[PDB]
Design a protein around this ligand. Structure first.
Ligand SMILES: [Mg+2]
Ligand SMILES: [Mg+2]
Ligand SMILES: [Mg+2]
Ligand SMILES: [Mg+2]
Ligand SMILES: [Mg+2]
Ligand SMILES: [Mg+2]
Ligand SMILES: [Mg+2]
Ligand SMILES: [Mg+2]
Ligand SMILES: [Mg+2]
Ligand SMILES: [Mg+2]
Ligand SMILES: [Mg+2]
Ligand SMILES: [Mg+2]
Ligand SMILES: [Mg+2]
Ligand SMILES: [Mg+2]
Ligand SMILES: [Mg+2]
Ligand SMILES: [Mg+2]
Ligand SMILES: [Mg+2]
Ligand SMILES: [Mg+2]
Ligand SMILES: [Mg+2]
Ligand SMILES: [Mg+2]
Ligand SMILES: [Mg+2]
Ligand SMILES: [Mg+2]
Ligand SMILES: [Mg+2]
Ligand SMILES: [Mg+2]
Ligand SMILES: [Mg+2]
Ligand SMILES: [Mg+2]
Ligand SMILES: [Mg+2]
Ligand SMILES: [Mg+2]
Ligand SMILES: [Mg+2]
Ligand SMILES: [Mg+2]
Ligand SMILES: [Mg+2]
Ligand SMILES: [Mg+2]
Ligand SMILES: [Mg+2]
Ligand SMILES: [Mg+2]
Ligand SMILES: [Mg+2]
Ligand SMILES: [Mg+2]
Ligand SMILES: [Mg+2]
Ligand SMILES: [Mg+2]
Ligand SMILES: [Mg+2]
Ligand SMILES: [Mg+2]
Ligand SMILES: [Mg+2]
Ligand SMILES: [Mg+2]
Ligand SMILES: [Mg+2]
Ligand SMILES: [Mg+2]
Ligand SMILES: [Mg+2]
Lengths: 145, 262, 206
RNA sequence: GCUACUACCGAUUGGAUGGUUUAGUGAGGCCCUCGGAUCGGCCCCGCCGGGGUGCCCUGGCGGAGCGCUGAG
RNA sequence: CAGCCGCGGUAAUUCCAGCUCCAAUAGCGUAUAUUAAAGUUGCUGCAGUUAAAAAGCUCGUAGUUGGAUCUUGGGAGCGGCCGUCCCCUGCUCGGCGCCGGCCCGAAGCGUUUACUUUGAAAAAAUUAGAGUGUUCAAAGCAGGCCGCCUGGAUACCGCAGCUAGGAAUAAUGGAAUAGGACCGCGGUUCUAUUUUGUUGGUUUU
RNA sequence: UACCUGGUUGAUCCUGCCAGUAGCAUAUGCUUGUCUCAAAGAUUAAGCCAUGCAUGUCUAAGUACGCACGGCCGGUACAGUGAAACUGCGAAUGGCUCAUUAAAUCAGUUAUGGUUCCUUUGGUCGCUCGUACUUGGAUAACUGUGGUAAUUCUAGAGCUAAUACAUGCCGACGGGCGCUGACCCCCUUCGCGGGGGGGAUGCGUGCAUUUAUCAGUGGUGACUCUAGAUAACCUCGGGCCGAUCGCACGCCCGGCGGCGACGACCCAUUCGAACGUCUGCCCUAUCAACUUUCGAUGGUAGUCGCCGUGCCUACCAUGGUGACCACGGGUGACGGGGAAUCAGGGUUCGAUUCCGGAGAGGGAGCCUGAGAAACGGCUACCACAUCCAAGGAAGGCAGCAGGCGCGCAAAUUACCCACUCCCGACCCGGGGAGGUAGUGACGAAAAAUAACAAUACAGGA
RNA sequence: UCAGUACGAGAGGAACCGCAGGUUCAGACAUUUGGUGUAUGUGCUUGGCUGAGGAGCCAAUGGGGCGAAGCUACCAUCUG
RNA sequence: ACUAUGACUCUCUUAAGGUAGCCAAAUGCCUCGUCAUCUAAUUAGUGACGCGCAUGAAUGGAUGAACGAGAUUCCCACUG
RNA sequence: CAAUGUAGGUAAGGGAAGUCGGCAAGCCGGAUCCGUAACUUCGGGAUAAGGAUUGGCUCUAAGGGCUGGC
């Protein structure tokens, strides 16, 4: 869709400027510097969590994770954690063993199947050659008759 | 048209399903599958219109979602899956395997069999393709690709498969004398011995047949289905034997049946 | 777009066709690639069915083949010499199919030298000071001398090809459609066909 | 001779509607070659940890060539 | 008023009323397109001396139509002189097998159309149409016995295309400066290939 | 039931026409009590539309650090719900209409040995010889400042995922198979030779891809088919060889493991689609010759395109159709399946509920997608329309109702997913498709508005 | 603007001071735009002539582009 | 047999009494005749009408392609 | 090197409104290749109308003579 906007070039022909304070100067502004707000979130996917805190491949994350509280009247105080993503867990290790035993199975199928076909086919040629030897005995009879 | 049609009108459905004139506007469109749109029978139809257990789709959905039924030895939950000819619809709770075979009229018949004989099925092969590493592959009428078969399995043959494994046990060759179901056209659901084969380059070859009662009839290969050695079958056949008796013989038998009922 | 269709033109008899629909997306043609000589630049193309097509625009090398010895090799594309379609594919250096390019003899001279232990090219006068090629041609064992002397029986080559080798440049014909595959592969011209194209060039010169 | 009606010719290079097209101009997409706002990445040195054996690898604080180099 | 003929100028069977009487009956009237009636567009099926009608005469390519002439009969058995069933191609591999030969089966080849008969093939819906107590019917394809029993058929479906039978009627070729058939004889040139115990090559037969 | 009658005359017989007669639609008039079916703004204006709705969707199984709800046993993540948002899939079907369009569409008939295919189904899915006990970095939803007269318009600051996007190995894999081959051995010979073997080191070493040469497992009526041998080739705008997910939890002095979900390249498959063959269409001569360098008919080589072809480009050749009606003009012509009428022959109609085509103001152009030259997706110009603070904003009922206008001429802004089927990630959602009622003398079927007895009378066996 | 007011049933509908501009006329000027342009200023160019190149000339202002200064226009501007 | 007109008839005057054709023209006073077109607007111009003060038949009438240093009217492009 | 003249030139915007009247000046102009109506004594009308091209430099090809298919 085609829409009209205004050019980037600044002049008095403007109504606002959104400004971001980079460096904190001499004076102490009461509205801004006093009230501290934290950053809402930290890495969600475990692999970026692993890069974040330099944890090893083997060890557990559950132990180090921070969990922020939940508390209000009626309900009890609680703490809500994140879904550990990328966890090398016994289940997943089972999935890992699983695909390799299945790969065992497809390799077993291809090999047994090729050997079975080779036996059936080589046997077929053996009987066909014996019948040809039969055709040749009939061939000498037919030429002599 | 910018593409394929997703709906089906009630009248355009083929009449050999015997769908009625006045209940509703639509018919259930088969999903693609191993069987063509026009030769097949939806499961909902075999169930409600044919078998009459369920009235509506909510009851079919719950029975279908119980997952008892197992089509071609594999579980299928798509209600418009086309189960076709020789196709064994097995139910476990009842302990009842049915095989979809044709009546004397083009329609199918309710021909029950035991689970023992019902335990396997037959498949006509269509083409022998040679595979990626000198590996022969087969292609049947119902799209099963079996690899490493015998080179002796050929063009118009059949095979006696096993539903559990999906592997060719035996096969029956196209030769003189073999029985033959006619699987399309005017003689659809006929049975008769292969008396003669007439070749035609370009236009496809005709097969002359002789009925049990000497009534000859020809048919084209597309509508042919080999079924046994000689004139002696290895399978269960419908009552009637695909004979298609005449209007006079039906007047006598039907009328006499009315007389017998009283 | 550039439609491909019969309807836009007359019938056999001469009568004019009235058009029954507007243009369709299957009645489609596309702009020609016209891939030129230069450092690699291949743009990819989506087509019907989500398929790919690697349309070449600039192309420096190609997997050119010597058919007789059956020794194809990847080589830099040095120049377009002649084009049968339109002399403008000669005039403007543009790569297409059936383009008669030139290529550096050295790899062919090098392979034959390894195989037969004979010289390829080497204008009458120059001799190797390093002596590596002669060391390679000599110092054969007894067992391997039977093999290489027997090879000398079929180690003969044509004068017409050898004269170009002495010069250094082989005539090559492109076969692969670069606008299709993104490569400018082809095969070297040989023998009688080659005498023909030199006769045609002699004629074009006049 | 009288009353009524009907088509016809009829100055106006007549007017009004569509329809093929010849010729000028011709927005705007699509394609191509450049382009490179802007945003990276690598390397380069100075101030410091952690590991190694004066040398090899890493993270921060400054500068700047932007030495090279990327999407665009 | 009256589609039309006609009615009405002082006893109006034709107008306006009343009195009656007719047709059809929950239906009838009026208008327009259109169809049979139309042997008034005619192939089946019209006219053409005088009712409307034949070029003033002859020539003339396409178009349309065209004489006669070539296979008639034969063998065995059959039914009440008569009719009908049985039969009217020819030219590498095995058994009705029998004592190399004979026949059959199979493969390939057949001077050619129109014409006629078969089958397949034909989208359904529709039409005709079998069945079926919607209380009858119009409809529908359902239903019926007191667990069981059944139906949910069938026909027509131009024209062209294909498939195998028939060969009277209408074409169409063929031997006439015989460069004519069969079956044979010998050259010139080219080779399918078998060959001489084993390594290699050629011509022969 | 294969039917005629009045009428020119002073009267007769003819050719001959006019009027009568019976069906089938459209309208209107008058009348009208019951029950079962039932068409319904095509005919003029492909003229114009206010309003509302007509396509969305989540599993135990792609993503939860909002208590927004929820077990209490925590500090060794997550019981379980979950607005929202990302992700994925669909929205090319259905519906409405018939203006254009005359061998075109359509019908039948065949062909793709000249092709593509999201999905469905079935085959393959540790075949490569050279961190994997699992890697990298954003981004939304959230919080907090706002802007406009005005759009389901949106900006800046904090943040963050994946079956999104990127990078990439050990493994099985332990070796084989071609070639290279220092050198080594045996045999024979006076020895060179001649014969037989080996051999360090190096090169190659999956499927899929591309080109060239050599030979002929399974097919075919016939393949340049299928498959084989060798040389090598392969875009970083990188092709595959699983950096996912849920249910149970076992068995072996942490090691082997189940059943699925989802996602994968290629091959077959299905729905089908798309080019071609054969034959067939109404009026017109007050339309008799037509075509061409702007391709007409052939040829050669290419381009594009998934292939065949003037599809397009270049160079040559000069062809092709025509009284067997071409060519041109008309058509109140979308086609067919069918309907009405009938003795037999025929005649006219067929927008219309099934199939095929085309189209959404006029024309054109395009992104996105397996699939669109899409119109309930965008960009222009033209036609027409709506608001403004003057800078700007937004538009398309030949969807349903309803309305304007044209007319002789045509319905209620109703109820429901309960039936039929369809979509979606789906055991849960949605559906003006559809169905159901209201109006409705286009029409079809059956059927009341009195029957009986006794008394008189008139008549009759 | 005064004023949608006085007046008049209504229909209709003014005037005085101030403010902004215009027509016609007269008198100057030329910053800017335009015109002119043989400063024969500067490229290009047709035909011929100086052996060729270079540099130039003749064709009654050879032709065509752009153009300084200066004159100059309700065709620019100012004041009454 | 509407008025008008007068097909038709007679008469006076002369030897008959303008037939075919044509126009407000280079021929028409009253006259810028009337109507239509051409213009925003037209005493001009073009096409019909005819009572023609005073049209008219080798004192030749009507037409008519080509040609004109002939007379008028309009339109395009173009211009001090 | 002033006005008045005589003979030469050029002008934005407008385009005969000036004027008895397009008087005068100005536009058009040669060639090739297309295309060319009304009417007609069928010879004409006709360069009708109406469009496009045009330079320099560097190449190819086709057309001829003479002596012993060259
Ligand atoms: Mg009366
Ligand atoms: Mg009749
Ligand atoms: Mg009739
Ligand atoms: Mg007469
Ligand atoms: Mg007569
Ligand atoms: Mg005559
Ligand atoms: Mg006559
Ligand atoms: Mg005859
Ligand atoms: Mg009469
Ligand atoms: Mg008479
Ligand atoms: Mg008659
Ligand atoms: Mg009548
Ligand atoms: Mg009506
Ligand atoms: Mg009543
Ligand atoms: Mg209508
Ligand atoms: Mg209509
Ligand atoms: Mg639709
Ligand atoms: Mg139409
Ligand atoms: Mg039909
Ligand atoms: Mg349809
Ligand atoms: Mg169709
Ligand atoms: Mg459309
Ligand atoms: Mg559109
Ligand atoms: Mg809407
Ligand atoms: Mg739509
Ligand atoms: Mg509309
Ligand atoms: Mg429903
Ligand atoms: Mg609806
Ligand atoms: Mg007032
Ligand atoms: Mg100035
Ligand atoms: Mg000036
Ligand atoms: Mg010079
Ligand atoms: Mg100037
Ligand atoms: Mg006049
Ligand atoms: Mg006169
Ligand atoms: Mg005179
Ligand atoms: Mg006179
Ligand atoms: Mg005179
Ligand atoms: Mg004249
Ligand atoms: Mg001027
Ligand atoms: Mg000017
Ligand atoms: Mg004046
Ligand atoms: Mg003047
Ligand atoms: Mg003059
Ligand atoms: Mg003229």
């Amino acid at each position: 869709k085609r829409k009209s906007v205004r050019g980037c070039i600044v002049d008095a022909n403007l109504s606002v400027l959104n400004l971001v304070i980079v460096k904190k100067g001499e004076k102490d502004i009461p509205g801004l510097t006093d009230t501290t707000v934290p950053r809402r979130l930290g890495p969600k996917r475990a692999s970026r969590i692993r890069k974040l805190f330099n944890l090893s491949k083997e060890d557990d994350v559950r132990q180090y994770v921070v969990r922020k509280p939940l508390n209000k009247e009626g309900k009890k105080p609680r703490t809500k954690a994140p879904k550990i993503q990328r966890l090398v867990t016994p289940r997943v290790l089972q999935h890992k063993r699983r695909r390799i035993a299945l790969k065992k199975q497809r390799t077993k199928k291809n090999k047994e199947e090729a050997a079975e076909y080779a036996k059936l086919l080589a046997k077929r040629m053996k009987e066909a050659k014996e019948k040809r030897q039969e055709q040749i005995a009939k061939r000498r009879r037919l030429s002599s008759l | 048209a910018r593409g394929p049609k997703k709906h089906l009108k009630r009248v355009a459905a083929p009449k050999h399903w015997m769908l009625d004139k006045l209940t509703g506007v639509f018919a259930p469109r088969p999903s693609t599958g191993p069987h063509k749109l026009r030769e097949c029978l939806p499961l909902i139809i075999f169930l409600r219109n044919r078998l009459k257990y369920a009235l509506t789709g909510d009851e079919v959905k719950k029975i279908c979602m119980q997952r008892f039924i197992k089509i071609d030895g594999k579980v299928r939950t798509d209600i418009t899956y086309p189960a076709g000819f020789m196709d064994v619809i097995s139910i476990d709770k009842t302990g009842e395997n049915f095989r979809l075979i044709y009546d004397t009229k083009g329609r199918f018949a309710v021909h029950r069999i035991t689970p023992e004989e019902a335990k396997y099925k037959l498949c006509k092969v269509r083409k022998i393709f040679v595979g990626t590493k000198g590996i022969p592959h087969l292609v049947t009428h119902d799209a099963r690709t079996i690899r490493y078969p015998d080179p002796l399995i050929k063009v118009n043959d059949t095979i006696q498969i096993d539903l559990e494994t999906g592997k060719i046990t035996d096969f029956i060759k196209f030769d003189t004398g073999n029985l033959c179901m006619v699987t399309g056209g005017a003689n659809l659901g006929r049975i008769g011995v292969i008396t003669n084969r007439e070749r035609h380059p370009g236009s496809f070859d005709v097969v002359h047949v002789k009925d049990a009662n000497g009534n000859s009839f020809a048919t084209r290969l597309s509508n042919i289905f080999v079924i046994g050695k000689g004139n002696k079958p290895w399978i269960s056949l419908p009552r009637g034997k695909g004979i298609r008796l005449t209007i006079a013989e039906e007047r006598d038998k039907r009328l006499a049946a009315k007389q017998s009922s009283g | 777009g550039i439609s491909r269709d019969n309807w836009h033109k007359r019938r056999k008899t001469g009568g004019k066709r009235k058009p029954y629909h507007k243009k369709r997306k299957y009645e489609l043609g596309r702009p020609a690639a016209n891939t030129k000589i230069g450092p690699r630049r291949i743009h990819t193309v989506r087509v019907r069915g989500g398929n790919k097509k690697y349309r070449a625009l600039r192309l420096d090398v190609g997997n050119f083949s010597w058919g007789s010895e059956c020794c194809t090799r990847k080589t830099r594309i040095i120049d377009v010499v002649y084009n049968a379609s339109n002399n403008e594919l000669v005039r403007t250096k543009t790569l297409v199919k059936n383009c008669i390019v030139l290529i550096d003899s050295t790899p062919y001279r090098q392979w034959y030298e390894s195989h037969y232990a004979l010289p390829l090219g080497r204008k009458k006068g120059a001799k190797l000071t390093p002596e590596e090629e002669e060391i390679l041609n000599k110092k054969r064992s007894k067992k391997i001398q039977k093999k290489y002397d027997e090879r000398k029986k079929n180690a003969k080559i044509s004068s017409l090809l050898e004269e170009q080798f002495q010069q250094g440049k082989l005539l090559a014909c492109i076969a692969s459609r670069p606008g299709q595959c993104g490569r400018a592969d082809g095969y070297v011209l040989e023998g009688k066909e080659l005498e023909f194209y030199l006769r045609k060039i002699k004629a074009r010169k006049g």
